[PDB]
């Protein structure tokens, strides 16, 4: 079965555990390019009562660096917020819990904004069919495929 974090049947406990960044997308491409602050490689999600603890690593000059973030539930069900290079809010528009998770995030910094979308997998890669479904979700948010970056061949340290 599939669910959205904003949906009535969402079961947040089921997204707990191991995840990997498979594809990142943004309407401001530089944010997810080589030295972008949003080129984050997810490692795990720890589900807590009113928050999610996210563990990631970033890469630079071929060197991995760990970083953790705590995302808090907001007043709208299925939405979380976290401070990181500005103020962010995000939801999970589609996940099947066992294979993939698609997240949509809005960043606000210095009076500006941009959208980020991420495709995460339980394994270090996903099927071409799931990757195509992600491209379609990106299209629905006005993000061109040329702004979608597959990082499956570079998500391990
Ligand atoms: C539901 C947990 C998935 C992570 C939320 C998206 C955060 C994007 C990090 C910058 O690429």
CA 151 to chain centroid, in Å, comes to 12
What's the CA gap between 116 and 62, in Å, rounded?
Answer: 24
- Contact between 99 and 130 (Cβ < 8 Å): yes
Looking at the structure of the chain, the number of domains it has is 1
Experimental method: X-ray
Residue 97 DSSP symbol: S
Q: Name the residue range of residue 32's domain.
A: 1-157
Q: What is the CATH number of the domain that holds 7?
A: 2.40.128.20
Q: Name the phi and psi angles at 40, rounded to 5.
A: -110, 130
Resolution in A: 1.7
- Bridge-based pairing of strands 148-150 and 20-26 is antiparallel
Ligand 1 binding residues, C-beta < 6 A? 24, 38, 40, 42, 45, 54, 90, 92, 101, 103, 105, 116, 118, 120
What's the CA gap between 97 and 11, in Å, rounded?
Answer: 9
**Count of all residues that appear for the chain in the document:** 157
Residue 53's closest CA among 25, 14, 85, 82? 82
């Amino acid at each position: 079965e599939e669910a959205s974090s904003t949906g009535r049947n969402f079961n947040v406990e089921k997204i707990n555990g191991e995840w990997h960044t498979i594809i990142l997308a943004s309407d401001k491409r530089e944010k997810i390019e080589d030295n972008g602050n949003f080129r984050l490689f997810l490692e795990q999600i720890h589900v807590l009562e009113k928050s999610l603890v996210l563990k990631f690593h970033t890469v630079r000059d071929e060197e991995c660096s760990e970083l953790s973030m705590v995302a808090d539930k907001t007043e709208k069900a299925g939405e979380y917020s976290v401070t990181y290079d500005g103020f962010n809010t995000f939801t999970i528009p589609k996940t099947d819990y066992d294979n993939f998770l698609m997240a949509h995030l809005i960043n606000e910094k210095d009076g500006e904004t941009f959208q980020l979308m991420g495709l995460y997998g339980r394994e270090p890669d996903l099927s071409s069919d799931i990757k195509e479904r992600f491209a379609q979700l990106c299209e629905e948010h006005g993000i061109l495929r040329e702004n979608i970056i597959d990082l499956s061949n570079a998500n391990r340290c």
